[PDB]
Amino acid sequence: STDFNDKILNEPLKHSDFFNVKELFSVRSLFDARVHLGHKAGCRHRFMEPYIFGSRLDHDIIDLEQTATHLQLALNFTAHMAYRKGIILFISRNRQFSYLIENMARDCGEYAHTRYFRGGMLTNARLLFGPTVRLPDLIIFLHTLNNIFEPHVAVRDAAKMNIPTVGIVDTNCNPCLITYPVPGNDDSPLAVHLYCRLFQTAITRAKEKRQQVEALYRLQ
Amino acid sequence: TYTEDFIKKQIEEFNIGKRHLANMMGEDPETFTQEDIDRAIAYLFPSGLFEKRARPVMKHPEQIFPRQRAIQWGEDGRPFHYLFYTGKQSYYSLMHDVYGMLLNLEKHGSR
Amino acid sequence: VESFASMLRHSPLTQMGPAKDKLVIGRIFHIVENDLYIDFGGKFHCVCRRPEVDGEKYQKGTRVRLRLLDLELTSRFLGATTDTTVLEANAVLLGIQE
């Protein structure tokens, strides 16, 4: 099993961009998707200030140069977790995109939770699902806020359960406990569609790469 | 509680008893059915008890033991359904389907 | 390579300046009885009532003329440290675009 570990699970960690996620997006595409449009300054969260380019007539503009690097890191992490056959759970309480996110989760062979989040789903999972239930290895937030404009409880619960989180954070969101935050607009349908496309493509590409690498290992 | 080996053994015991009852009643074991089983058990063990459940009964083990214990994940631990973590995967799958049909139509004496 | 600063400087939304009493073009993308959800290129859509005049032509994909009042509707209430947002823009539906 040592040779298998070394060649399959440790080889991809020796490359800066193993799955070539940098070619999935650019600053131009993020701009075309309106990823830079934040909320007005009155709704600004303090911890989001380092990610804000400026305020245009009282409307926060997200710095897309930083969004590009943050998205690069988040997509790389997601691809590496999908290559390792980890359970990926998408979460979003925005009802405008529930159907889209559930379809995308079904399509990439991963999991979705867009419905009401019952207390203890993660921290009390053994009581709710069964003693041998396996929890997600990665949780992705397309929207980190619930419908009362407070953080989704899953952010804190995943932090408690030591599950890394990727998240889209708008100017009024709190990115402190998200492991791989991606500053950007989470309200425009164009932007949410772009995020779903990117994450789905990264996951499917990583899984296909895993299959190809194992096939090469067995054949050769 | 009823383990899976336990119910397995009850399955072979029921099948062997079914073949034996077919032998006893002179019927062909291949085509011997559950209604035939009920009729033969009623003849061989007559019971006038008013409660139908109290009367002697020879059912398939699946009909006796409830065993409503569905496995929702495999050996690797990955759940089979993409809505598993909602806890209501069947109900929310149905709601997702209905919403999809509503979207498609929008693009285009009983109870 | 065009940097983000250039894109922002030359963006039509940036060029528009203040959004108050600005005439914009919107697209109807969702209808709920007589409520039309119109996207005009901003962060948020605007919800407009179907006019009583020539109401049948207002369908999904239709191009409309709007007079923007506010790109996002927010207001700070007593005892609040942050603005409360309704996640919707304010605009006035003028009619169809020929």
Partner: peptide, 6 residues
């Protein structure tokens, strides 16, 4: 409710 069912 524009997103009825979700």
């Amino acid at each position: 409710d524009p997103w009825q069912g979700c």
